[PDB]
Design a protein around this ligand. Sequence first.
Ligand SMILES: *[C@@H]1O[C@H](CO)[C@@H](O[C@@H]2O[C@H](CO)[C@@H](O)[C@H](O)[C@H]2NC(C)=O)[C@H](O)[C@H]1NC(C)=O
Lengths: 556, 115
Amino acid sequence: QVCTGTDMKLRLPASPETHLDMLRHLYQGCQVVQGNLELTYLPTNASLSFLQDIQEVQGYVLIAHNQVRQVPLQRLRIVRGTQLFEDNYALAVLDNGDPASPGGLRELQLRSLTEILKGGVLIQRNPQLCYQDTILWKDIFHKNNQLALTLIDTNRSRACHPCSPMCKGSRCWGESSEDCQSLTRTVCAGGCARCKGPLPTDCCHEQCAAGCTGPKHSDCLACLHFNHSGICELHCPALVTYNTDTFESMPNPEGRYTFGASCVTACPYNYLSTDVGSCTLVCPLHNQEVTAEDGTQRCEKCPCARVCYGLGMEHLREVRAVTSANIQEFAGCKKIFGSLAFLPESFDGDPASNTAPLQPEQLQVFETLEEITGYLYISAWPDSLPDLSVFQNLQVIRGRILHNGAYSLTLQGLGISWLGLRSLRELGSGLALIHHNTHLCFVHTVPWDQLFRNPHQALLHTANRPEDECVGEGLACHQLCARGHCWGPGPTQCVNCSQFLRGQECVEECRVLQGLPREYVNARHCLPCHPECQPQNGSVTCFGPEADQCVACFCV
Amino acid sequence: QVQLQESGGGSVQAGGSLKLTCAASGYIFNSCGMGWYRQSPGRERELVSRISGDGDTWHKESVKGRFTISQDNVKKTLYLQMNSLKPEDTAVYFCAVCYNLETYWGQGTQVTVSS
Ligand SMILES: *[C@@H]1O[C@H](CO)[C@@H](O[C@@H]2O[C@H](CO)[C@@H](O)[C@H](O)[C@H]2NC(C)=O)[C@H](O)[C@H]1NC(C)=O
């Protein structure tokens, strides 16, 4: 029911062939959009029925550069505007029109939208759009909306059918009788912020937003602040109460975490639980992340040890790419708080800022890297390097920050022939996008479903090297890779070994009983012997690597 | 009624400065944001600088550091101080005030930067 929005603004989707698939995966079944609902560059034939359940948007709504004529958001009741398009608009409808029937948005059909808490409305250059000038927009803006500057272009290249004759006051989102605008603010008695009618009895509880079906904080169409199990309330119950004599902290059995506009018993997967009682993706200031025995992580206020920040964090907040100017900042980092993006400028250099091209050998700085809390984005890569094995120790990309707000892993326009991300076992959130890598095989040998953690995730892929061109050249998983899962060719690229590991190579059998030198197995790895251990012709030989655990000769 | 009117437009060289004045008359106040829009020929009217109803200031990135928005509650005026002007700032500038959730507009004043 709760999903994450995007953060792409007007930027062009790199893969139009899969852009719509991404939106479907994000929003199918979703009712509450945490973040921004951005619907852009959609073609005339785009089926958008997967948006039909969206009821709340926490950030802004952007509908831009589409040729599709209808965007079905008829259940959207409230846009909270906690983020704003251009920092000013909760609703932006731009350039939806074409460069028999012409494309271009024809109606908004926001027939349930009765609440814009913060932000104005921007509607520009939509040549087929009607009814933006038959809506009393001031009714939708919340009583206390402090930023509602609004600019609505009403040039159109077609006649508009009048509102249905059943619409009171000639206000409607479209031509049908179901598109009449219901007023919930300007018709209220006693200046109450929202009502369901003209009398004082119709005033909503002040913790409601958007409207009501009755007088109580359980009759709201939306909560102004927090939904506490069907009750709209100003704040969630604290996780701690204080003993009334000592004021020592006591666990509160009714305590809840804040998550968007709701009170939850536990933070959802990939979110951090704070001591403040909030679910967050980025820890607040002066804090440190701690992993519990579950794998669940808590944020904790803090002599706080030094940390490796990636792009989008601290001094790298504005930095576009990993370059030769900042590459050394990641030396020895097991965990990068933030993201990594490799762009053409990373490896071309930039003479304007006198930034030298990033050399391939410098990418070895990531060999220690196990975890990226943000995303990994690679749109250029050294042609000499056949894979991404500089990240071969990377175990998880959390995706707490997502490229364009959607993608935790992006690989595009590269010359690599395989992935080589042989430790990658989790994409905590976001989609993977792998396209237009002309030489890249070993994409469908990866069990992507094992890496994902929620059903809104998927691999989107196109214009890589065709599966049959890879098969006809003999580029398949090694025989020792369990279930034909691998990240590249040979026995060092298996997801899971069929037998044993001697270091990085999957082998059929350790030299426990035969072969020289002898080895002992430990967690299905072939670790050797102390050389002064005489090889037993019959049985085992070593139980450890030192001369202590040694049979035939400190066995010196 | 209520009216907004801009003055102070003019023509300067690149690097010049101008101060636009938006004079409000009638019963109107900045309750839900006020600011300056600009519109070039063959281009959209777009927000440049803004003060919200609770006093938060915002500037379009291309004018950040060069434009200064201010107000005089006694005179009921909104100002846009423009320094280090660039040819790309050439446009008609409009003030807009949001009051009781309705947006009111001036007539616009021409600013021309030559280079
Ligand atoms: C607050 O959240 C509760 C979930 O606990 C919402 O309750 C659901 O409401 C819909 C329709 O209103 C029903 O179809 C569901 O069966 C309800 N579920 C439960 C568990 O009660 C409630 O609508 C929310 N209130 C808001 C957002 O104002």
